[PDB]
Paper text:
For a structural understanding of the interaction and the selectivity, we solved the X-ray crystal structures of complexes of both DARPins with the p632/p732 hetero-tetramer stabilized by mutations, thus the same DARPins that were used for the in vitro selection. For the DARPin selection, we used the same p632/p732 hetero-tetramer construct of which we had determined the structure and that is based on rationally designed mutations in the p63 and the p73 ODs that enforce the formation of hetero-tetramers (by inhibiting the formation of homo-tetramers). The combination of an E363K mutation in the p73 OD and a K377E mutation in the p63 OD thus selectively stabilizes the p632/p732 hetero-tetramer. Of these DARPin F11 represents a DARPin with three internal helical repeats and DARPin A2 a DARPin with only two internal helical repeats, always flanked by an N- and C-capping repeat. Titration with the DARPins yielded dissociation constants of KD = 10 nM for DARPin F11 and KD = 17 nM for DARPin A2 and a 2:1 (DARPin : hetero-tetramer) stoichiometry, while a control DARPin did not bind at all. We also measured binding to the two homo-tetrameric ODs of p63 and p73 by ITC but could not detect any binding, demonstrating that the interaction of both DARPins with the hetero-tetramer is not only highly affine but also highly specific. A detailed structural analysis further revealed that both DARPins bound to the hinge region between the first and the second helix of both p63 and p73 ODs. This second helix represents a special feature of both proteins that are not present in p53, and this explains why p63 and p73 interact strongly with each other but both do not interact with the p53 OD. The structures of DARPin F11 with the mutant p632/p732 and the wild-type p632/p732 hetero-tetramers were indistinguishable, displaying the same intermolecular contacts.
Numbering used by the authors:
A (entry chain B), B (entry chain B): 351 to 396
C (entry chain A), D (entry chain A): 359 to 412
E (entry chain C), F (entry chain C): 1 to 159
Amino acid sequence: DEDTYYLQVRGRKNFEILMKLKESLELMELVPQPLVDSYRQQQQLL
Amino acid sequence: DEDTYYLQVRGRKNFEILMKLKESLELMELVPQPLVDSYRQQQQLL
Amino acid sequence: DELLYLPVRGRETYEMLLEIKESLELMQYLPQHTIETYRQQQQQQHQHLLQKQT
Amino acid sequence: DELLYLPVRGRETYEMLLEIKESLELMQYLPQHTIETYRQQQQQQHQHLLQKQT
Amino acid sequence: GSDLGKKLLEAAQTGQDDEVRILMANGADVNAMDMVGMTPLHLAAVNGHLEIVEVLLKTSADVNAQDYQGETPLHLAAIWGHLEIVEVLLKAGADVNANDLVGHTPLHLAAWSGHLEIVEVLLKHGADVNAQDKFGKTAFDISIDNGNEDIAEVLQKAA
Amino acid sequence: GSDLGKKLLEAAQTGQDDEVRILMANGADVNAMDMVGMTPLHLAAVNGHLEIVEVLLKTSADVNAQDYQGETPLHLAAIWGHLEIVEVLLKAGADVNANDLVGHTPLHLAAWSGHLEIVEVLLKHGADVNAQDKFGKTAFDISIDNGNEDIAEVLQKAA
């Protein structure tokens, strides 16, 4: 998906965790698929 | 913390993960401290 | 309810995942009256939707 | 960079944590030019703050 | 786990009396455990579902089952203020002095929550007022911490 | 890990030339690994920091170090289009045919990204056009998938 969603969260520490995961989930999409595939292959070998 | 924060996230699947964690993080605060303490003691024993 | 084992490099990631996992599991201890009160609060929060203005 | 071990009950929680952990770790593969482009996008997103109206 | 076991856990949690009886009749494991090790009896106790507790107590379900945190159904009925459920669990042989992983008894948790009448029932069944938790604390100590002076008076008189 | 090692990893990633030289002079581990097993040389290669790559290649840092995914610095310079870094890595003895965990060579990843000139340099250093990944795919196969017909022509001519 590509479109934009809003949420509200109570608690600054909750907000800080969600903003850290918002960042990693959004940036994750810019990682080339071949590196995602090697990474998943590694997690499998464990 | 008690006050309310807004974020935006791109991607429905990203939004769905964040809404699941928003829920669990917000509800977590309603769990009595003694049960939080037993839970942390258990994670420690592992 | 199988006991699965997540390999984690580094303290920072491990602690983040622990806090998330804790929040996911400890919901089980809440009564449905508590869950329903939360759900109504969340529903009423909608009456006033978020929008980009200011 | 010690290899720590997170005990997880159940598939659903394990898979959620895996997806989060993946997102956290795979950022390392991004060039700073990519990170800076994202950061500017995020900064410009502020120019139009979220507020409860509609 | 099993499929029926997970369904029985959800039916007990959500108070679906009829679905609990149908799941049980179809072989659902009364000893099924959720992700924190709670049985259907624990979840019926948390969620205040008296009729479902009473149904499960007619089975071989362990009234003193401990979740992964050491909590018994009685701990959880006590912390969440479910007086009638506390009564039926004790009538069914619930260990009034069961200790969870941080050394809380049901009396500790009723003290913590401020459920006076549950404290009185636990005392009637011989709850140990002297039992100290991980952090040295009696029920009386907790009831002080949480401004439950009314329970702190009842506990002092029992001591 | 070490403290200096983590700092050297961040300095290399963020292009802090002077901080890289100071960290190294103070004993920072050139073989330090981040959470995905990348060394400072990998991170300088990802992030397009030529001067930092050149500095690290004067050390005992392994030009062919593999992260936990099997990626070498050359893989990562190739996928991210850092031509000058691809050149200096190969001059320093980078394995042009290094295989990561899903059987990608640097040529696969340059094909995937559409970096024609890097494909040409990898070929000049004897990149294997016939090497097949986990999913049976050559570089030529990928370049087709990703509409890089220009690279698919160069690879067909090499075959």
